[PDB]
């Protein structure tokens, strides 16, 4: 068995003597609540619909339809709209439907009732049932005539169904459409790093945790946490994402004034030796000694934690995100040179980091850290142990990036950050054990 | 008079090749079936001789008209010509297949190889991250270097391979802007000047929509678009935009700011012609299935040259759009073989749809007290669509020559609904009203003749009326935003280009664009190889093998 | 405290690699702050560092337990732009090799963003922090200014035959021999500057051979570093095995 | 002796153009930097004069070498040539860009425009539903009509438009079959005769895999594939296959049985080159991203002509595959601009990788007691990969001219790993073992030189060792079935064509195919425009502008 | 799977990989495979997992426990967890060495991940992959 203690985002002990099996996505009640909650949630931009209609800016990407402008006082009538949407989205009065106004009625948060995701293939009912309820509510509230109803519908839904997604629309989630998945199990991995930093209000520990919960739940859905992989996955998840034993936060604090990427590597090796995870194997004539491990899963988990420590201290020192690509690379390369043992994910964090560095500093694609995610072709390759560091690095930005969460993620960040378990996931996961 | 009088006289009362047709009236109900075979037609004879020579040269059977079913070659009835509508250009159908007509291929290449990409966000990256000052002078150097580099030439490295200019002379970048100071200060060689290219009211409308924003109209090489695919266009653009920013702003040649420029060019600042479509018909962006009808209408340029004849705008749009959607897309990409030339030619030959649409617009404009004054209501739609359809059907019945030209019911249905839907959209300024009229026309037509189109023609037809004003997930959609991937429209000939003309009709002579001013200005450029203001004229010139603006050939690098 | 061992090997190349990793490198020359700023090309020598965002003291920062315990660098606290230095190093026994410039950064400096390529190696940092790093690599044996150059663009040269004068080719001619010393009168992206910076005498071929971090068959052959080869093979074998089944 | 002696002498010790290179030794460590600029190179001068003429004719800036960064034109170092490996063809890099080289374009067109489609299921539909008897006589008539109809000609209807044979002479259908009686009774013009085209051992192995089944090798027109995309190929084929069954079996021209034939041609009986790829890089079937390395290796035909030199088989495969994957796919479809010619040219120029691979195969064949006799184990992989990589790296160090030719580390890494991986796969007959060697070579290389490739080169490299024998969902995959969409491989130059050569190495000189006998036989046909048995020779002939097999031009229908 | 391996018909659509044939007695060992697959697919003993051999051991029905679809975006864990359990069970049952394990994996999973789906594989559902949906809500509609 494997037992850990769970610590908060600021190093306070929350739970002692926790079986790692109890933080599994397949058992922990808070992971279930977070994942199913995200599947059920949509953001509605009522001010956005009002502006789209007033300017006939239907479909996005520069579009304007002359002659089709409509003036509807949507935000002013948000209370009546909210009521109508509630009644349409709910199945039974008293079910777990949520509809709440935010920001003076300019936005709604909608959580569809659970049955709309349980008796369904996917999570898209959160978008479609919300968009249909909003469209119907607007047509009723404003007595919209038949010849104008398609204008309202396209203001809400964007170009769908000409496009596969709601391009130019005003109903959105942090998750992307199913058809954009690179492969099996990638839906929960397709959450932009900027969105995650916004959901967690720039708390880097909580951002890493939310991203790690989604990434590792995705690894389960990929079929890659079965049998001889299950314990391996849970060790790395708990150590990197859930601050197991306070390794991430405590080491970050210890190294936070003078530490470099190299300091984090050395701290990881030192701790693995002290804890009997690795030990000297063969001494070469120069004095260099190779190390062996008695527990690949545990060594790997220590490396996963150390990779996040290095991100926090190096990107935290820059107060900027871009260096996360190089941190992820050089932590692994240096720890392998120091020990002759494989780095985190046996080369796959390093490899993801090589391509990520390239595709965040070149002409060919990518962008800043904030646009990446576990489904991105560049950053998908680690089994959940790279992108949590990316999201944490985004949270640490003091204002360097152009395509920041303020630019890319305002709607979904405002809505999804309202949900306590999404915003404060470490606390939630520990509360469930 | 009827507008098709001349074309029907050319087609049937004058000999074509050695088809022995001579005299008679275009109202005559009987005809001779001389069974002359393919040798009556010089174009078929040229094809037959070419096929026989291929068979002999390669030692493997090629074209032979005697391989028709039953060994009975085409030309049992006489083989008769087409007149390009609005012109005196007379040709064979064979001169109008997309494979055989270089202007048709270039129309598609010029759409596929194009995209629009903003400048404002890119300049913001430079300002924010590097503190650079952007001026007309820095922009002018950027545009000079970009036009050298975009076709595939080097700016930064050494000992480099480059594309050969002789193969890529159709590739370039221009800019347009709502900022009048910038429009004046950028070197005029690079500028699509909105005030010069559009009438004053149209220019004002475009400027109001774009504000002070600035844009690049990018056209990558034809030889490249033909080797690759539509999704290659924005990628090609972005590589060379990125390289040019590096040089023009003295950046590290590959730093984090370059990555934010890449995301700008490839995503945040990018306007593609259309997006990807679903798996069964999998394609990425900048393919015809993803092209909305509003974008296709805005690519066409007749409205900026002749807005005083909105019917002509509609008809030219129908021509460009029907060729692309039915001949190249449905008849090519989505099927192939002999394909769908004649499903499309009713949009641009023999002046028949033109007669019907001019008639219906005259009817509506008189009835409603001037053009464009009808209210968008059930009663207006019912009136215009019914009276138009009755005129059009009666014309086929009064002129047997027109019925024989449009020998397939699908052709007749498309023609009638273009007239009814186009006249309705023009009368109301309302694309949805136009679609409703399109479908009512079809329903009347079916009952009048006891037939409509081919086996599968009216799938969208029968879903049509109910889905015009539906708000369902995959049914609701304003007309301008419908396109070749709107579910009901995703399969069948006879509709996509017609709907594009209906969308155009809701704006022709009234607005400068239907859905996207950025697309509209992009194509307002005489340097683009295909003349989007006069697609009929380009099709006709190329039917005569006289159109001289083909890009992308490999002649320069192969033997004579 | 844990004493790092860094890297295997007993050859001069391996010893020099460990010197780079531990910042145990000899100072070879002096370069003034203003001369370095001129070569870097990001602002006028002696001028204030531009900002990309306001200083942390002016705007404060969101509540974050990590921000509370991780000290910003001086450049981060001030809001400096992210700027860079980039080097190209000849394969003909240039003292540095790209990965080892990056290890030097990652081990010895807070708040780095190093990138390794074959013909160029780069580090992006908040500007004032970057200058400290650039000075260390430029003044020490990490750089020989005949065999290396500061090149933010048009980097071609690392794998080319040396010029007859022993200097690595620069398409843009940013630095060259004059009077027995290397001089430079352009910034790193090729813009002429109004000064001529003296970068010292280049190393002799014999000193370069002794100080280099590259293996070469005609100096210190990679084949001869049995420890490094064994290390590579061990990491390969364990990565391979653990990818099949993640078990010791 | 080293295989690259001659090529390095051509490149550096003999003048090229007016570059003034003369004399010296290929081992010399120093060079002259004459700063002659582009005027030293006739090809660049031709380009520059073309660019200036374009600028003047169109009134918009085009190519100008003076627009290089800093105004310093290329040719500061001398501009030096390339020799096509295994030949005496000498050319410029500019003659090897895919845009400038018609054979390279035709290689891709010939893959994109091709598919294989069974006959057995279609014949079963006819037998089951209609009770038809299928005989050699009915098949021969079917194939005659199909070859008339496939390019786009009519067989059922009347007054039809058709494609012009002069534009579509590269389109045809042949058949192949494991049924030896049917192979002899079908008219020889239509048959790819497996016994004629393959050595007896290879023919036997193909026939064992295909049994008695029968197949159509279909090649749709190049002019069509260029207008359209890869997903158009199977659709074009199926339309004309369907038409021909209707005529050849006296069917209703559109009955339910025709629908089951359509499903047969388009789905159940269809072998495409590859399937669709995901949304970020959205493309449908028959595009390079979906092409597995096993299919690409089987398209290449060198193994049926010269199996006695398996190293040459590997090298020719590397040449065809690296050109496609790096130049057209990664450097075109997925990016563009100047692109990736020189990332690819190490596979097919200057005899350097050839030297290294011949050396490593000699090492392994002697050590393990004959070619192909080594056991597929960690110890074998470690040995061959290490000794190969040491040889290769020492060669770059002994011969400064080779280091300067392969001036980018990515080029050097690709060359080393092709040699190490190819020799290991050939020694073991095991593609997985070859991939494991590829990655060990990279790791050694990085430590030797303190550098590897470009910024992002070793993403797959570092994931590589651990993913060779992974069984995870999106990591496990036998080598033959990996391709340009295997996740780790989906982005970067220097690898896809190399892995294709490693896959080929596991089978060269031992097996008739790597993964798909149907693909193998399809391309065993001299009528295909591109010579898949000698891609290097085709590239070289086209580099000289002498290659005469280009298809798809519009010359016949445009003015001079 | 047994036939795919014996004939090296890896990936379907006419494919055969010479030299990679493997002869495993899978059907005759279906009970032992079923037991191993059950332990791997289940989360907790006594949950709602089903694994049963059908038709003389030629097939298994697998119903993954509900939590694998509840704490998941989609339905595909039924395919992926089954395919991984089966692959692992075959490797252990037949003592398959590292160099041969990719052959077994590709016999089970087909061409995935070169292809988006398990083309030529041996684990299937009546529902198609989500990426083949024409639009929102179409997954349960994609049953032949
Ligand atoms: C701007 C970038 C960053 C980026 O995203 N792409 C660039 C540039 C781009 C441009 C260069 C065209 C031009 O000269 O204007 C193109 C051709 C892609 C395109 N846009 O068409 C390209 N690189 Ni690059 N690029 C190459 C290479 C390389 C090598 C060159 C090292 C040297 O010593 O010259 C290095 C990477 C490394 O160090 O490993 C490199 C860097 C870089 N590469 C640096 C510029 C380097 C510089 O400032 O000189 N490329 C190569 O290593 C060989 C192949 C070569 C490609 C052209 C071809 O294949 O024909 C080209 C491929
Ligand atoms: C990363 C991704 O780009 P985005 O991040 O989606 O813009 C992707 N490009 C690539 O993979 C480019 C590959 C070719 C150029 C680099 C070769 S090393 C694509 O366009 O789909
Ligand atoms: O006859 S069908 O309607 O099926 C096809 C018409 S092209
Ligand atoms: O310099 S980069 O490695 O980013 C690109 C090489 S073409
Ligand atoms: K309800
Ligand atoms: K289990
Ligand atoms: Na094409």
Numbering used by the authors:
A (entry chain E): 2 to 434
B (entry chain A), D (entry chain D): 2 to 561
C (entry chain F): 2 to 249
E (entry chain B): 50 to 193
Show the paper's wording.
In the proposed mechanism, the heterodisulfide, made of Coenzyme M (HS-CoM) and Coenzyme B (CoB-SH), would react with methane to generate methyl-S-CoM and free CoB-SH through a radical mechanism catalysed by the Ni-containing tetrapyrrole cofactor F43019,20. Despite their physiological differences, these ANMEs have extremely conserved MCR structures, similar to homologs from methanogenic Methanosarcinales, rather than the phylogenetically distant MCR of ANME-1 isolated from Black Sea mats.
Biological samples were retrieved from Ooijpolder (Netherlands)31,32 and Vercelli rice fields (Italy)14,17 and cultivated in bioreactors for >5 years, significantly enriching ANME-2d with nitrate as an electron acceptor. MCRs from ANME-2c and ANME-2dO contain reduced coenzymes trapped in the active site (i.e. CoM-SH and CoB-SH). In both ANME-2d, a canonical glutamine (position α341 in ANME-2c), proposed to be important to anchor the F430, and juxtaposed to the tyrosine coordinating the CoM thiol (position α342 in ANME-2c), is substituted by a methionine (positions α343 and α347 in ANME-2dO and ANME-2dV, respectively). The substitution does not impact the F430 position and provokes few steric displacements in the vicinity. To our knowledge, this is the first report of a 3(S)-methylhistidine in a natural protein and the first PTM identified on the γ-chain of any characterised MCR. The location of the 3(S)-methylhistidine interacting directly with F430 suggests a compensation for the lack of the methylglutamine in ANME-2dO and ANME-2dV placed in a close proximity.
